[PDB]
Amino acid sequence: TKCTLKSFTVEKGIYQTSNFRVQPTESIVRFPNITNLCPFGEVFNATRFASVYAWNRKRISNCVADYSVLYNSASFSTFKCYGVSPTKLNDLCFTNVYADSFVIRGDEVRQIAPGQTGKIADYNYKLPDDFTGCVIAWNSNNLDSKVGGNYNYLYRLFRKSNLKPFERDISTEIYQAGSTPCNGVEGFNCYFPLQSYGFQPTNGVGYQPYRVVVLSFELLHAPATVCGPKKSTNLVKNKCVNFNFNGLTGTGVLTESNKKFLPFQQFGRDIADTTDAVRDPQTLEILDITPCSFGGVSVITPGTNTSNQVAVLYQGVNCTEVPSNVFQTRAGCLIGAEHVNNSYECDIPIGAGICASYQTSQSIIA
Amino acid sequence: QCVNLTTRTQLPPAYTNSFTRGVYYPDKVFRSSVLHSTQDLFLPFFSNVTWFHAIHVSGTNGTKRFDNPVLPFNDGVYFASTEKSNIIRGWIFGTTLDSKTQSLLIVNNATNVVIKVCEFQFCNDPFLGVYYHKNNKSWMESEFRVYSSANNCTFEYVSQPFLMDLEGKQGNFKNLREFVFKNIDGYFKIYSKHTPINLVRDLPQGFSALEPLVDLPIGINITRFQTLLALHRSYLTPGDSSSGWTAGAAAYYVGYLQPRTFLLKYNENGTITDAVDCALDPLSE
Amino acid sequence: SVGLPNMTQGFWENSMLTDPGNVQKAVCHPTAWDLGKGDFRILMCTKVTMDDFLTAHHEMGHIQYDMAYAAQPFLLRNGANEGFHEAVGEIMSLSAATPKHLKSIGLLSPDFQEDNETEINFLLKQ
Ligand SMILES: *[C@@H]1O[C@H](CO)[C@@H](O[C@@H]2O[C@H](CO)[C@@H](O)[C@H](O)[C@H]2NC(C)=O)[C@H](O)[C@H]1NC(C)=O
Ligand SMILES: *[C@@H]1O[C@H](CO)[C@@H](O[C@@H]2O[C@H](CO)[C@@H](O)[C@H](O)[C@H]2NC(C)=O)[C@H](O)[C@H]1NC(C)=O
Ligand SMILES: *[C@@H]1O[C@H](CO)[C@@H](O[C@@H]2O[C@H](CO)[C@@H](O)[C@H](O)[C@H]2NC(C)=O)[C@H](O)[C@H]1NC(C)=O
Ligand SMILES: *[C@@H]1O[C@H](CO)[C@@H](O[C@@H]2O[C@H](CO)[C@@H](O)[C@H](O)[C@H]2NC(C)=O)[C@H](O)[C@H]1NC(C)=O
Ligand SMILES: *[C@@H]1O[C@H](CO)[C@@H](O)[C@H](O)[C@H]1NC(C)=O
Ligand SMILES: *[C@@H]1O[C@H](CO)[C@@H](O)[C@H](O)[C@H]1NC(C)=O
Ligand SMILES: *[C@@H]1O[C@H](CO)[C@@H](O)[C@H](O)[C@H]1NC(C)=O
Ligand SMILES: *[C@@H]1O[C@H](CO)[C@@H](O)[C@H](O)[C@H]1NC(C)=O
Ligand SMILES: *[C@@H]1O[C@H](CO)[C@@H](O)[C@H](O)[C@H]1NC(C)=O
Ligand SMILES: *[C@@H]1O[C@H](CO)[C@@H](O)[C@H](O)[C@H]1NC(C)=O
Ligand SMILES: *[C@@H]1O[C@H](CO)[C@@H](O)[C@H](O)[C@H]1NC(C)=O
């Protein structure tokens, strides 16, 4: 009060000094349930895979891609994410996802990478210079290997020109290396384009089958349909906290309300366009949003020449949110004044018909 | 697959007036007796909407009407169909309606709502007729001539199967099915509402707030739509695939939206009970 | 310890390093199998003697040379001449038969003195 009035002698009366405000204790973020994750549970555990020249592109558009189950699993040999960090995969949205599944030899897995060249890249499947996605590969020598030679997987070896990024060729015309035209039959420079691979159960590292898939992420003029799985928190009702209900934000105490919303309405607003009620996206219950307690701090004190005792008043603040008698008045919580049942002339006006005075072993009374 | 429909009497288009309809919830915000005023694309009160009907009179008289033109899609449309039986079983949205661009297909084949977003090749007269036989006498839906092929599908949705009451009752109308389509930010919003009524003259008079039903993120452009009707194939009506048709008790209205200002009124529970147009009848201003 | 990589995974699960006996007939001649598809195995009935101890290092050097030149087409997966492939293992077998290596591994006693008579005898035998 001395600093507010800029004087060492404070006269008898009530003076406003500061403003009280209940600071938020913790912050909660709530989101709806995460069901029907993606067809990733079937695109990785498929029993049959296609060749490298006939790779299948599965439509992954509308499903919550759970990248945590793929990054935490310690069953992938090569896991390199280009243009994006593996940890930030569950914090960004995308438009369309495509998983190209195909089996390739182990010693030539390094050819499927941006900026790399070789024999399988420019002839079977080539990646652009810039790529926004990850690569997943795992050894499949346990089940994709039979005694006698596995001639079920083939690959395109001979081509007349380089392939474009994300290009798939179906025509299997015979290659021509010389000036003599190939009349549909093999000859000197007329060879078959497709060549079969040999997968034996006794082969060493490098020649074993490795099921490698490619994830492609693209962003165009369309609403994002695939996002990362956001995690919720616990619901704490009766305390000043920071809430986040599916994009919303603010600060207030969440008390159980009785406003029966409509089956499609999410949050409610009272007059003057203020968010006062939201629905929990998980339990579908409604609750009110009351702002946290705040108000001016007034210090009732007599003259400095009389005494140095003071009475603190929190205007419009209940006594249960303040943290030497503590008495609750209709004007606010008053601390430092003894409430008496007698009636005297109003000396220091407080409010709501209550006044304070410095009388009788000697303290401020209300 | 594409089969035309000949022997159809042409008539000038009819018009009616929608007194107070097309009012939908602009956003998912609960309001309890606050009388909010919003600025969005609604249907103006007492507008001039088009009336498409399908009448068929027995004998060598009457008119054979089967209305399903390619109507434009100007900033949203209002579809209200006074149906006696299940005849209107879907719509078609798009710009080119061919393999050039993509098109939205929301069609019902008597099982459930089937929504597909691909580059179809729609015919010039798509329909989903019924077949009425003498043995196993029950209205069955065996007809699909909407498009020829389907390639480059982006979005698809087929809900759980369900029965369909294709009984061709005779009498008055039973219910009204209202729909408000709008696409401003890629999302295709649909606002549906079901209200029983017992008139066969014009659009019912009253007030009913349309609630949001689905929100499909497609991102495609929509400039012209078309309504898909049903047909009846029974005895005493011989003909080829492009003839021998019959219908009746089928009518749907189409109204275009425009930027307007409305003073929506909410009750103690959050439902819109009344509204006024600020750009008409200055008593409402 | 010199710089050569470790053995392959199939080398420890496909090699028959012990004579099965009378259950089946198998030749115990030390041979270096160069399959060419990442699998390398040695066929030898290695006993607990010293001659077999150095022949094992000879075969391992052969396998190392095979894995070294396995990074070339089939028409080149071989030594430079007809003597290098054997010499690569022979030099290892000669350098591994030294008493210093045997006493460093734990075969020869550390307190064994290196007299010149044994060195002269070894040089004469070589
Ligand atoms: C393929 O099948 C395996 C075997 O069930 C799956 O591995 C399980 O994954 C769940 C989900 O995290 C774990 O709770 C189990 O402990 C895993 N089991 C084993 C034995 O590891 C695997 O997740 C499946 N693949 C995909 C893509 O879902
Ligand atoms: C979201 O998930 C929670 C928990 O997985 C669901 O809450 C359950 O609801 C059922 C039926 O109402 C109760 O029998 C369970 O006791 C609830 N469990 C818990 C932990 O509360 C909730 O219903 C789900 N919401 C949606 C929309 O699917
Ligand atoms: C009969 O059906 C055919 C297709 O089943 C349609 O013919 C199209 O007619 C329009 C103009 O009349 C042309 O622009 C199209 O090119 C025609 N289609 C084809 C594939 O050529 C039309 O619905 C009906 N045509 C007639 C003459 O009745
Ligand atoms: C209505 O259309 C839906 C989808 O166009 C049909 O559902 C398909 O039915 C076939 C065989 O009846 C199945 O092989 C498909 O798998 C179904 N689709 C899906 C997405 O599951 C439905 O059968 C049609 N109903 C009628 C009466 O024609
Ligand atoms: C303060 O809180 C208590 C407990 O909830 C309540 O009984 C009392 O009425 C409150 N005071 C005021 C002024 O609202
Ligand atoms: C004032 O009156 C109340 C209610 O009768 C009583 O509980 C309280 O003790 C009284 N205080 C004094 C100081 O008499
Ligand atoms: C609706 O428009 C048509 C054509 O412009 C016109 O003939 C008709 O009279 C109009 N109806 C009303 C009620 O104005
Ligand atoms: C039964 O229904 C089928 C329609 O699938 C129809 O073709 C047939 O004529 C009906 N009657 C008999 C006896 O099959
Ligand atoms: C499908 O249509 C979209 C429209 O933007 C286009 O980008 C895409 O390349 C098309 N895909 C195929 C396989 O035609
Ligand atoms: C339709 O919307 C698309 C948005 O992807 C836009 O590219 C196109 O130009 C629009 N068409 C017209 C005629 O404005
Ligand atoms: C509002 O809801 C209450 C209880 O849910 C109900 O008694 C009352 O009839 C409702 N009012 C309207 C206009 O629907």
Do the beta carbons of residue A145 and residue A201 sit within 8 Å? yes
The residue assigned the tokens 């000949």 is B6
Query: Could you tell me if B216 and B239 are in contact, meaning their C-beta atoms sit under 8 angstroms apart?
Result: no
Q: What is the position in ligand 11's atom list of the atom closest to the CA of B273?
A: 13
**Does the distance separating the beta carbons of B29 and A265 come in below 8 Å?**
yes
Q: Which amino acid is present at B221?
A: N
Vertex A67: Cα angle to A61 and A73 (nearest 5)? 135
Residue identifier of the C-alpha nearest atom 13 of ligand 2: A283
* Strand ordering across the sheet containing B103-108: B70-72, B224-227, B90-94, B103-108, B113-122, B147-158
- Does residue A318 line the site of ligand 2, with CB under 6 A? no
Angle at B167 (CA atoms; ends B164, B170), nearest 5 degrees: 145
Q: Is there an atom of ligand 7 within 6 Å of B48 CB?
A: yes
Helix residue ranges, H only, chain A? 2-5, 40-43, 68-71
Best residue among B86, B108, B109, B116 to mutate for probing ligand 4, ranked by most atoms within 8 Å of CB: B109
Strand blocks (E) in A75-232: 78-82, 96-105, 133-139, 154-156, 175-176, 190-191, 194-196, 209-218
CA distance C32 to C61: 9
- B153 and A265: CB-CB below 8 Å? no
Method used to obtain the model = cryo-EM
Alpha carbon of A132 to those of A34, A78, B154, B228, C10: distances in Å? 25, 16, 21, 42, 37
Q: What are phi and psi of B86, to 5 degrees?
A: -75, 95
User: Do B108 and B89 contact (CB within 8 A), yes or no?
Assistant: yes
3-class secondary structure per residue, chain B: CCCCCCCCCCCCCEEECCCCCCCECCCCEECCCCCCEEEEEECCCCCCEEEEEECCCCCCCCCCCCCCCEEECCCCEEEEEEECCCCCCEEEEECCCCCCCCEEEEEECCCCEEEEEEEEEECCCCECCCECCCCCCCCECCCCCCEEEEEEEEEEEECCCCCCCCCCCCCCCCEEEEEEEEECCCEEEEEEEEEECCCCCCCCCCCCCEEEEEEEECCCCCCEEEECECCECCCCCCCCCCCCCECCCEEEEEEECEEEEEECEECCCCCEEECCECCCCCCCC
A168 alpha carbon to ligand 8 midpoint, in Å?
46
Query: What does the alpha-carbon distance between residue B38 and residue B266 come to, in Å, rounded to a whole number?
Result: 13
- Whether A44 is in the pocket of ligand 1, judged by its Cβ within 6 Å, is yes
A226: closest chain B residue by CA: B217
How far is it, in rounded angstroms, from Cα B22 to Cα B212? 12
Pairing type for strands A267-270 and B29-30 reads: parallel
By C-alpha distance, the chain B residue nearest A59 is: B154
* C124: its two tokens: 């004469």
8 A C-beta contact, residue B191 and residue B180: yes
A32 contacts chain C (CB < 8 A): no
CA neighbor of A34 nearest in space, from A229, A300, A281 = A229
Strands A354-359 and A363-365: antiparallel
State the DSSP H helix or E strand holding residue A278, giving kind and residue range, or none if neither: strand A274-279
C59 is catalytic: yes
Calpha distance B146→B112 (Å, rounded): 16
Encoded tokens for B250? 């089928």
Q: Which of C59, C82, C90, C117 is flagged as catalytic?
A: C59
